[PDB]
UniProtKB/TrEMBL annotation:
Coiled coil regions, renumbered to chain: none
Pfam families the UniProt entry points to: Glyco_hydro_77
EC number(s) given by UniProt: 2.4.1.25
Presence of the UniProt keyword Glycoprotein in the record: no
UniProt name for this protein: 4-alpha-glucanotransferase
Protein's UniProt keywords contain Glycosyltransferase: yes
UniProt family annotation: Belongs to the disproportionating enzyme family.
Length: 499
């Protein structure tokens, strides 16, 4: 990939303003892309776009391939008379996922029945054609979701054995009995990918590239794990014997026990890494580049015994990252991947990243707690093949972070900024001071969360890791991101050779 010198904004589509309880792939999404282009921005970064479960996290999806039905704009379906929409009373500035769950799933199901009643033959055949095209993952995903309604929302590895173990007759009978439910889930997928495609075409017409994201590890309770248990370290009952995480750190005392199933990489290699090829293909249908979270896991991963309640016990296990990425380069002709390389990284990880020319990340909130700090701009690679952020979706807003930062951090930050000619008078100005610093740097891409453009405090934090609740909920208000915000971003980009 060739990275131009430019800037972008980080905004998950759920955070878009608009009616009916969550950001969707419609007019407000187009309005945001127009805002971004007029601000001089060339990149729009989102988080993973798959269907979510308990905790609402984009990084723990029911499928590695599916799209999130919550992002479906219902207004076009209402225009065709498929459904009547009535706002139940959604809050301002945040997603209420309980109310969204209770109101949007039934609205989608009503819209599906309306479509079955009133759709033209053309629409019906286009929907059937989509199903045929995507069957290699969609048949499993749709049946997986349908079976949740037959089994009280249980995960797949708690279903009756004939279904859990995917016996041929059990599946055939399930598919016939749940034909309507299967079709409904296929329908949500058809709509998602249709609406995303339209939005991607609009971005492309405006000169904007979309940066997507995926977790290296998939979710325990997902259609692909169910369909391919041999690829994972599961016991005979389909439960993980070991799980993903990271060991104790400078930051974390016990580390993080993520709980994801771990790949049997030997099995994936023997199978030709088809899972990874398909995942990247699917990513590249939606995005122009894709970040992979926990990129270091391609070189080695921390294996936690499933019986351990923390991440303290375990061992590092090597993974065939070099072989995988050689195959990717060979078969795609390029590797349009961004490496999430935060936390503790080794020379082996850096070499893998650099062998394939993958841009890494830099986070300015991490730069001020100790002049050799790699997150300080003067320490960035001479080539500048990195993406600089003030913070990611995992960090507090920059104003939130500043308000809780240590005395030594605050003092060093102020002096370092002054060394770059940047000064500020009030704490609410710190987000823009740090955005300016990132734009002055050699980093090819500077990408900022929209909360920092707005200089919002901790209430607008997208995710607080560890905390299982309150996350992924921040939304823009209508008109909050103003033309003056866009003019300020454009001025900064023009001032730093990013336009
Ligand atoms: C990179 O990937 C991270 C790991 O998935 C992601 O973390 C967010 O999303 C997770 C799904 C969420 N919960 C898991 C973490 C645990 C402890 O660390 C377990 O207790 C839970 O059972 C897991 O489901 C994380 O808390 C959340 O931070 C990052 O957002 C992403 O950038």
């Amino acid at each position: 990939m060739e990275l131009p010198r430019a800037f972008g904004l980080l905004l998950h589509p759920t955070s878009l303003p608009g009616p009916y309880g969550v950001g969707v792939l419609g007019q407000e999404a187009r309005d945001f892309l127009r805002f971004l282009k007029e601000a001089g921005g060339r990149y729009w970064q989102v988080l993973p776009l798959g269907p979510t479960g308990y905790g609402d996290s984009p990084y723990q999806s029911f499928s590695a391939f599916a799209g999130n039905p919550y992002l479906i704009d219902l207004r076009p379906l209402a225009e065709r008379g498929y459904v009547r929409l009535e706002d139940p009373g959604f809050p301002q500035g945040r997603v209420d996922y309980g109310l969204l769950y209770a109101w949007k799933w039934p609205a989608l199901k009503e819209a599906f029945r309306g479509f079955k009643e009133k759709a033209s033959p053309e629409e019906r055949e286009a929907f059937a054609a989509f199903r045929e095209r995507e069957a290699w993952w969609l048949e499993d995903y749709a049946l997986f979701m349908a079976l949740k309604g037959a089994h009280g929302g249980l995960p797949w590895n708690r279903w009756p054995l004939p279904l859990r173990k995917r016996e041929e007759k059990a599946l055939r009978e399930a598919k016939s009995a749940l034909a309507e439910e299967v079709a409904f889930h296929a329908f949500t997928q058809w709509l998602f990918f249709r609406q995303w495609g339209a939005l991607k075409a609009e971005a492309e017409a405006l000169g904007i590239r979309i940066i997507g994201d995926m977790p290296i590890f998939v979710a325990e309770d997902s259609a692909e794990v169910w369909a391919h248990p041999e690829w994972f370290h599961l016991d005979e009952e389909g439960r993980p014997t070991v799980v993903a995480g990271v060991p104790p750190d400078y930051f974390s005392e016990t580390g993080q026990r993520w709980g994801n199933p771990l790949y049997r990489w030997d099995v994936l290699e023997r199978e030709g890494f088809s899972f990874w090829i398909r995942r990247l293909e699917k990513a590249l249908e939606l995005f122009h580049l894709v970040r992979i979270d926990h990129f270091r896991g391609f070189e080695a991963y921390w294996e936690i015994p499933a019986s351990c309640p923390t991440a303290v016990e375990g061992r590092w296990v090597k993974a065939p990252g070099e072989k995988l990425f050689q195959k990717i380069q060979e078969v795609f002709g390029e590797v349009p991947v961004l490496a999430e390389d935060l936390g503790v990284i080794t020379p082996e990880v850096e070499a893998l990243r650099d062998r394939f020319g993958l841009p890494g990340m830099k986070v300015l909130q991490f730069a001020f707690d100790x002049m050799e700090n790699p997150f300080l701009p003067h320490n960035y690679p001479a080539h500048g093949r990195v993406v600089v952020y003030t913070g990611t979706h995992d960090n507090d807003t920059t104003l939130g972070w500043y308000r809780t930062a240590t005395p030594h951090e605050k003092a060093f930050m102020a002096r370092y900024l002054a060394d770059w000619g940047i000064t500020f008078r009030e704490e609410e100005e710190v987000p823009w001071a740090l955005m300016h610093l990132g734009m002055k740097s050699v980093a090819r891409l500077a990408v900022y969360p929209v909360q920092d453009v707005l200089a919002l405090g901790s209430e607008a934090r997208m995710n607080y890791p560890g905390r299982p609740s309150g996350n992924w909920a921040w939304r823009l208000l209508p008109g909050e991101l103003s033309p003056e915000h866009g003019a300020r971003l454009r001025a900064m980009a023009e001032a730093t050779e990013r336009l």
